[PDB]
Symmetry: C2
Subunit: 106 residues, 2 copies
């Protein structure tokens, strides 16, 4: 069900501005601050079920944004390309083809 | 206005997937295809006023997405750096600096 993964930290970083303050605060507490559902429920004095549905729904919204905008998938491929380019700084042909790949993934 | 029209044309490809079907179709017709409000209202058999209100909210929404995510601005900055790199393919130190510039953008 809910899993604290690297992916969720990145999706939040990319899409947090698109959320409401309440949606952001639920994900900040759970994923960024590593609170448990019970700790959040006690902080907001709401039921655990309520906390779970709020985090589940908001997480699904962020995944929906990623499917539409693909910012994390594009960032991941660019990061891989930058690392490879940093291994071929002295080869014009390699750099040229990596620039092409950076343009094509857009 | 002209400026809003130009902006909707630059920003549409980056954010159209976030819009509802109605928001997307009305924005396409008004800003990309130059239909009048009455023509759009007749095309979809709806209130000219509802169309005006929808387009007004949508135009503001799209500019707000660019203010928050900067996808068009960043795509164009990356485009310029890629083009600058193409002019220094034999300068290892310079290429390394451009990659640093790109990493600072993300």
């Amino acid at each position: 069900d809910l899993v604290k993964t690297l992916r969720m930290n990145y999706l939040f970083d990319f899409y947090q501005s698109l959320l409401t303050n309440k949606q952001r605060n639920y994900l900040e507490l759970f994923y960024l601050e590593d609170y448990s559902l019970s700790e959040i429920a006690d902080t907001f004095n709401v039921s655990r079920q309520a906390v779970y549905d709020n985090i589940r729904r908001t997480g699904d919204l962020v995944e929906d944004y990623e499917k539409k905008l693909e910012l994390y998938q594009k960032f991941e491929q660019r990061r891989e390309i930058y690392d490879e380019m940093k291994q071929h700084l002295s080869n014009p042909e390699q750099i040229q083809r990596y620039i092409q790949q950076l343009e094509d993934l857009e």
